[PDB]
């Protein structure tokens, strides 16, 4: 539900998935992230490799890396 708030906050087109563009705009708030670094983290969370981060892949990544959250 707190993971649900951050996900919906950055899913700006309301399609239920996080694209590279929306993840880049999301990472622009935390600080400065190079284009090669956002590509790496997109490929780490995108388990099925379809080009998007759905909500199940996001919550699966969070409670598997509690040190990151």
């Amino acid at each position: 539900d707190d993971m649900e708030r951050i996900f919906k906050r950055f899913d700006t087109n309301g399609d239920g998935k996080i694209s590279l563009s929306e993840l880049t705009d999301a990472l622009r708030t935390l600080g400065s992230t190079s284009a090669d670094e956002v590509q790496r983290m997109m490929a780490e969370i995108d388990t099925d490799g379809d080009g998007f981060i759905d909500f199940n892949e996001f919550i699966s990544f969070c409670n598997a890396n509690p040190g990151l959250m």
Partner: antibody
Amino acid sequence: QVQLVQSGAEVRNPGASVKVSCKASGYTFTSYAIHWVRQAPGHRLEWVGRINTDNGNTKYSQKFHGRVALSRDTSASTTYMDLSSLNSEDTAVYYCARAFYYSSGVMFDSWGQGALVTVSS
Amino acid sequence: QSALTQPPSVSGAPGQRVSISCTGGSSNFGAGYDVHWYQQLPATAPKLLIYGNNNRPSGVPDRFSGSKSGTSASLAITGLQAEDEGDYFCQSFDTSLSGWIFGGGTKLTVLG
């Protein structure tokens, strides 16, 4: 300047196995996933699997029934494809491709020259 | 349908225009996945021609243009040249199969 160089051609017998390599250069190897695609003679492109170069977790197509395995070597920037229990239906060219995210998805932007595998008598 | 359907072959005189269709289904095009096009010239590996319905990488002229509906996609090639002869594949992601799918490919012949 992104380039994927694959190993040469291989000939195997029905039941043997084969390993094909795919060396990457010209970019950060551990920041992009590598996909494997095969093309049988007179057939369409067939997706084999995906491997995260960093983790390195894999994702295989169920059309192989656990017969294919992907592996990676970050120190050499090379991904390997092993296909056991070979049969004549596996006779194909095997390409490796890099997944590159764009604004609204991901694409296979760079391909390797391909490696011919022939499972003959 | 969880597969991409293409016409087997297209042909046209040098300088003319051809179109290559690619129909999908609710689990691929209808699921919000863009279509990519790849060009496989004779005796080479596939090359990225169109990504994201109608974006061209550096090196592809505007003679190649793509379109996409929620269920169909098309690849337009204007001003045919002899160097365009080869095979063309569309590509998308199917969510029911949870994998990448390619069309059967279309052999484009430039009439000589």
